[PDB]
Write a protein that binds this ligand. Structure first.
Ligand code: HEC
Ligand code: HEC
Ligand code: HEC
Ligand code: HEC
Ligand SMILES: [Ca+2]
Ligand SMILES: [Ca+2]
Lengths: 125, 376, 355, 125, 376, 353
């Protein structure tokens, strides 16, 4: 609620913007438009590209690498918008940059932004 | 108590802790059922618009469909498909116009037909459900044209092709009663029956005038194709019922939704989708409030419920929100759907006690139209 | 006995008496000094291996045995993907089913039959003692029992810590014992955000306990024939290597041309690369992926020959959804990925990284 | 404030939804997007169709016909949105109906709705 | 004191009393001047977007321009045209993609050129002004491509045609310095100078490295083409200045926008367009606030003003609102423009006293980008 | 002045102003028929017969009611020509107009101004009336005499009698009565459809003395009137260029355009258009559907059952105003007829049957 305060992760509600895996999400949480935490909504196309972040999990004290992937080919969902930037670097370090539409490799070459999923791909280092 | 976002955090933590793998992929929506509800957002006339597909029971968005400028949504009563007639332009809201119909699979939401409509023939208007309509067999979509003149376009969904326009008289709305038949409401106060073989001019017959010039019928009557029941309120809450189930119009006793005393005190219907009708229950639901006579499009905070046969009042609910549109699920123990344009929120109520059970917010910019399938 | 079965397989593994002319053991082609791969030059360089007869060449590159014990037994998963098994084409169910094959293959160890292998085992008093202690008296008198036992021992030995030590730099960094350089860290970040992670990570999500950088699936990445290897094998100009479809009992034409995803552990020291040994340099194997993404003319060209990569041996069933990522690896990112893959080298092979 | 109350016109501010000429407007006031009370913003197309209303002017006590004409060919302005319905009739009385996009006759066949102007075109009766 | 709606009510009322006629028509916008300001609304990644053209002196919308998905706006410094690079799809947000450039007349706002960009080559990214850029003569538009690899597209505005893609190193942003030359910022911490022609590998020359790999240079540097001055803040409010006025890069002394004590107490820049530069005053304006280090895109409530030559602080303004982006008019007694994404409002301040003068609200869904012409 | 008009009242009904004394202004502009021509010639009522009993015009005789409200011919600041007299605006004002029929050989056919003056001078009442207003000897100078007769006729046309404002429409705007439902519908259609873009005085606001014309010039794409063109004798190779035929108009874009007529008395002043091509008011209204409607019948002139026919002048058509995107159905044609009937002056209401 203080937007300038240090962001504090929780592991009890995935639709909230302080959910721990959403630490560098920019966009909308797919779970709110018919996707799930790590799946796209019907009709959309799952990109293969991502941007990454190391996000602290307050459940187990570990930091996990979240490779955000977009669900693409639909107008922006408009539900559960969030913008967090923990570790997020400028566009010249693109693997860490989250203003970029990460829709590359989506089926049917879909490039419009609908929502983002938050799957874990590895351990932080 | 536990919200959907909370239950999802707990399942994701368990998968993580247990080492359970799952492949990221495109979800399918759950099978269409009686409690699926669709909410269309005309977005206060924006050039692009959204439909939300909602599981009413969980109060959860299960999918969405994009549309163009003031699209008309339809939903097959049997759950087999959904479709809309929509409009796009080559440069956002300028340049070459394309009108088209899309049919969608209702669990993958993929388009299975894209059928171009020649010569930009759609009626661009604040969204009225009965300006685009499926025939009971679901093989034909009918759409209304206002320019240059009232006409109705026949679109073959089975053959995926536009067929022709029907010339009609000065009439509005399209209520299909058979594979080859629909009814419209004419300026002169009658209904017109339009019968069309594949060739020739259609066969057009009128009923008697059934309302006077000074009695104003709303843009949003309720029509149950399975019952063949047309429920048409006027500006004051007078309710017309027309039975079309015999293939011909039969006029039922007119019924009053409000009392003489409530009217005296300024009670009037008001909103967008002001009326709902429940087939199996034979029950009419009307959005009403105290209001001046020319505030007929404002939100209402109350719903009245009444027997379609008798016309007696069965309940009056205080909705507790500014409500613009209502509809009901067509199963037993139905839900009453109460959509607020201002709050961009669908409130989901028990249709018998009128109590609020759950709600779904963030439904676009100015959501206005609720649609349900009648599956039973 | 866990130790003892493995110890028996250790002896067999280095024993040439399991080859027809006694010139060749497992370790001849799977040389412990070279991450269990074949350092020997044949008619096609190091692309394919030469058999016990000193003339026959195989048609496929000899893979590492390191980390092979982490691969699941062959199966079809829920989404209809074949997974696991041994050999580039998965034709063996597991390590035990695999072991007996080089022994009877006339292009490899060339023993005429099981009875001949049993006769060699029975000639060595150390094998009579070791085999009978684990499998019972007379085991070596029964060709079928003897052959199955030898394969069991060999599979036990490849399951020991010696074959899968998890002591690469990557492993140390993951324990917090040291840190990646900036280049290696960039390479790691690239590997996990680009398409590599779609096939060269154990899991689709979450974290693996013993990561070996393969999902054990079957993909056709569209590689050309290696002409000099194919000429050496003698299979003919008209031969097609159908990959997984050659596994007995697989009939699905969609499986044609798909090969098992290799583990990338030790990849830096186990060149040449791919199932037919077609590329010499690790850089070239990474650059191959740019053929699917890049618009530059140089992306159509194999930098080792200066000629086009070549027509796929099997031009159908390519994994184009994963390969056609829409992004080209620039040279800085190829450099990073080389650096990162080098951190997957086991500690004892680090001295080899200079070579 | 009270949306169901009898609408009360003023003659002091053309950008507010209570300005007397807006008694049956549906959409956006063109004055808020670069038009004026009776002119279209640059880049848009003036329709020749209209719906009409008799609007009472509190200043001179007279009722005027306002024939609302749309400015077309742009996405909706999104500034100064208003919906009033004084004397507004259902679609079957289209000369008096205001859900309709009255873009007919606009140059280049422009049919998308941007905003509405409120010119006086006569006296009521 | 009298509002613009009030003044207009009064004039309409006097014309009606005087019997004054006027023809309803399409207005022209007033001549472009120094106090014209453009606000672009990326609309939180919506498929369609809007630009508002505003008279900063009156605080009045004088026009609008529609755009597609994440368009890049440019404004010619001399006031002669404006343009954008934009992207549409045949079915709202799905189907065939078309990237294009439009040029518009700055008073009628009609498109004067619509130039297709082959093979969908635009970089789709939250909007960075210097990802699409005009050459100083106004004859060429340059746009960035990311996929499959960093490249720069060349569009001839005068001949209205796409020309070619240029291959570049791993570099970002486009700061034109001459009809055939621009700069980019590289991953390696250098700038590259790219001198191009109609055909042939461009000549690409790197400057010295000027910053460590762990100082982060923001995505919204300010660049004054007429001064050749590139003003580039880091996440800590350290400011790099590069003089490109000679046609080669000259590194100026770095300045600190916050004091050491401010930094120790958590002051950092943050927002979207965090920096502005006034060429005639040689002054830098930076949006700053107290914040955690990884909240670098949150709004800020203060602006610091400092002399570009000495780094001496001239003022610290308390803005009194949540501000995401700033810019200034390039005339004497300039205006400081303070755009709030959350309030969808442009606040217009006196740049000398910092006092809020007026504001323009309802600017779309998530307006972020402010552009002005340097006509002086 | 009352005097001036009283003199013009005398001139207006005097056949001594035609060569053979068979016709006055009132012959073709019959006060009994709202100042138009009741007489049937070779092309019906489409065109009028002159003094010689044989010669026909090529244009329909218009009403003189309300013509005194038209401003003098001028080009406005948007570059639209406005006002004047004749269907093509070739006369600046009523004064410049009045002398032209007198000297037209296909009309009143006086040979010159001097012949007109000689006729005025033979009448003792005209010697008195003219000299009292213009000075003694006026009738002896052909130029002064002719200009004075033109002034008096213009003065007469500017009285209350030609422009009474006593139509039903006028009574309803004064709040003296109400339109019938049908009338009110026709009025609503009129001011919301494309009609009001040309047939209302002002762009917006309310006019003090509405005459249902903006005084502008438009080509609505009308066909030749075949029998009328034949009767006129102008030859089948003739083209009526409308405003372009005004001396001094040179602009090619004015070709085929004609002055928008006032719709007051329209119900009793058929046949319609500059060439009288349509006998029925409903046909005049239905003509506008040709630009909007898709129905096969919109291409067909109901009076003939044949296609309307190509425009006499195919360029400069007012397409932006005409191509409205909406067709008038029968009920709307009915309502417009009803509304236009309310523009009939009180003294002509018995003509409506
Ligand atoms: C003449 C060289 C040669 C000899 C000797 C040899 N192999 Fe191999 N090995 C290969 C080749 C070639 C392949 C790949 C063949 C194919 O995929 O069809 C292979 C594959 C394997 C694999 C599969 C690994 C994977 O990732 O798919 C295992 C396990 C293996 N060998 C173990 C053994 C054992 C145990 C022995 C001794 C009994 C042995 N090999 C003898 C050449 C040899
Ligand atoms: C679509 C699945 C897939 C993708 C994506 C993929 N690989 Fe591979 N990789 C394979 C398969 C299958 C092989 C063996 C191909 C063959 O030999 O037939 C392979 C072989 C390799 C080899 C040779 C290893 C050996 O022992 O011969 C290297 C190195 C390699 N990949 C690195 C990468 C990198 C780096 C990326 C990301 C740029 C990548 N791969 C993307 C499936 C994939
Ligand atoms: C032979 C029949 C005939 C006679 C006699 C006649 N007119 Fe006309 N009048 C016409 C015709 C025909 C027109 C239209 C001619 C044209 O537009 O070129 C006309 C047009 C007019 C107009 C212009 C009205 C308008 O709306 O454009 C006025 C004024 C007029 N006449 C007055 C007179 C006066 C005064 C007299 C007697 C001096 C007179 N006319 C004699 C047939 C006649
Ligand atoms: C583009 C301007 C324009 C529009 C729109 C227009 N008119 Fe006209 N109207 C004219 C002009 C000009 C004439 C005379 C045409 C001619 O004779 O050449 C005319 C003639 C008429 C006449 C014949 C009058 C006479 O004395 O001969 C009638 C009746 C008429 N119009 C009615 C209508 C109605 C009803 C509408 C709306 C359905 C309408 N018009 C639309 C300009 C217009
Ligand atoms: Ca190898
Ligand atoms: Ca006439």
């Amino acid at each position: 609620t203080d937007p300038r305060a240090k962001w504090v992760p929780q592991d009890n509600d995935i639709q909230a913007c302080d959910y721990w895996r959403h630490c560098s999400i920019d966009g909308n949480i797919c779970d709110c438009s018919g996707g799930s935490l790590t799946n796209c909504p019907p009709g959309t196309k799952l990109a293969t590209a991502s941007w990454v972040a190391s996000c602290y999990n307050p459940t187990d004290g570990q930091s996990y690498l979240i490779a955000y992937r977009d669900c693409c080919g639909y107008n922006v969902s408009g539900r559960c918008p969030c913008l967090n930037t923990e570790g997020e670097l400028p566009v010249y370090r693109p693997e860490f940059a989250n203003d970029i539409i990460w829709c590359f490799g989506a089926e049917d070459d879909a490039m419009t932004y609908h929502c983002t999923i938050s799957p874990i791909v590895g351990k932080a280092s | 108590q536990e919200t959907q976002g909370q239950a999802a955090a707990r399942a994701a933590a368990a998968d993580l802790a247990a080492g359970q793998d799952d492949e990221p992929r495109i979800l399918e929506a759950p099978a269409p059922d009686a409690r699926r509800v669709y909410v269309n957002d005309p977005a206060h006339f924006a050039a692009v618009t959204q439909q939300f597909v909602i599981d009413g029971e969980a109060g959860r968005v299960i999918g969405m469909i994009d549309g163009g400028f003031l699209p008309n949504p339809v939903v097959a009563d049997d759950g087999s498909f959904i479709a809309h007639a929509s409009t796009v332009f080559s440069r956002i809201a300028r340049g070459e116009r394309t009108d088209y119909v899309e049919v969608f699979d209702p669990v993958t939401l993929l388009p299975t037909a894209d059928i171009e409509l020649p010569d930009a023939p759609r009626f661009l208007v604040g969204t009225y459900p009965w300006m685009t309509s499926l025939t009971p067999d679901g093989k034909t979509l009918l759409f209304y044209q206002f320019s240059p003149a009232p006409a109705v376009g026949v679109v073959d969904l089975e053959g995926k092709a536009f067929k022709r326009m029907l010339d009609v008289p000065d009439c509005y709305h399209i209520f299909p009663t058979a594979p080859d038949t629909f009814f419209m409401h004419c300026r002169d106060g009658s209904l017109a029956k339009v019968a069309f073989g594949t060739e020739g001019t259609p066969e057009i017959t009128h009923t008697e005038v059934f309302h006077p010039e000074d009695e104003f019928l709303i843009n949003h009557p309720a029509y149950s194709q399975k019952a063949g029941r047309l429920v048409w309120p006027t500006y004051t809450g007078k309710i017309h019922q027309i039975d079309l189930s015999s293939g011909d119009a039969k006029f039922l006793p007119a019924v009053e939704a409000l009392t003489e005393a409530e009217r005296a005190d300024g009670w009037r219907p008001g909103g967008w989708q002001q009326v709902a009708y429940h087939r199996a229950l034979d029950r009419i639901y009307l959005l009403v409030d105290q209001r001046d006579e020319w505030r007929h499009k404002t939100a209402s905070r109350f719903v009245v419920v009444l027997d379609a046969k008798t016309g007696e009042r069965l309940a009056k609910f205080e909705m507790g929100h500014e409500i613009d549109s209502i509809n009901v699920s067509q199963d037993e123990k139905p839900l009453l759907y109460a959509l607020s344009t201002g709050d961009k929120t669908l409130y989901i109520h028990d249709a018998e006690s009128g109590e609020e059970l759950r709600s779904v917010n963030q439904l676009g910019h100015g959501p206005q139209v609720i649609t349900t399938a009648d599956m039973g | 006995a866990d130790d003892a079965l493995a110890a028996l397989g250790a002896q067999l593994f280095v024993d040439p008496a399991l080859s027809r002319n006694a010139t060749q053991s497992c370790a001849t082609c799977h040389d412990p000094a070279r991450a269990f791969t074949d350092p020997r030059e044949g008619k096609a360089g190091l692309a394919v291996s030469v058999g016990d007869d000193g003339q026959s060449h195989g048609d496929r590159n000899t893979p590492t045995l390191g980390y092979a014990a982490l691969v699941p037994a062959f199966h079809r998963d829920a989404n209809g993907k074949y997974k696991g098994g041994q050999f580039w084409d998965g034709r063996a169910d597991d390590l035990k089913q695999q072991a007996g094959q080089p022994m009877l293959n006339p292009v490899e160890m060339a023993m005429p039959d099981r009875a001949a292998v049993a006769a060699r085992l029975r000639d060595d008093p150390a094998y009579r003692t070791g085999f009978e202690a684990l499998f019972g008296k007379g085991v070596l008198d029964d060709p079928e029992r003897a052959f199955d036992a030898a394969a069991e021992a060999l599979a036990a030995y490849q399951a020991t810590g010696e074959f899968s030590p998890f002591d690469s730099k990557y492993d140390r960094v993951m324990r917090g014992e040291e840190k990646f350089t900036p280049l290696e860290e960039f390479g790691y970040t690239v590997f996990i955000t680009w398409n590599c992670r779609l096939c060269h990570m154990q899991r689709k999500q979450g974290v693996a306990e013993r990561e070996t950088f393969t999902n054990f699936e079957y993909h056709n990445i569209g590689l050309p024939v290696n002409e000099t290897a194919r000429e050496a094998s003698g299979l003919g100009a008209d031969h097609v290597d159908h990959g997984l479809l050659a596994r007995p009992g697989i009939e699905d034409p969609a499986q044609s041309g798909r090969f098992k995803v290799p583990s990338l552990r030790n990849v830096a020291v186990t060149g040449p690369y791919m199932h037919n040994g077609v590329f010499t340099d690790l850089r070239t194997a990474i650059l191959f992926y740019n053929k699917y993404t890049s618009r530059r003319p140089e992306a159509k060209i194999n930098p080792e020959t200066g000629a086009p990569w070549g027509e796929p041996e099997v031009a159908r069933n390519l994994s184009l959804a994963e390969l056609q990522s829409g992004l080209m690896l620039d040279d800085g990112r190829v450099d990073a990925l080389v650096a990162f893959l080098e951190t997957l080298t086991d500690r004892r092979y680090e001295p080899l990284l200079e070579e």
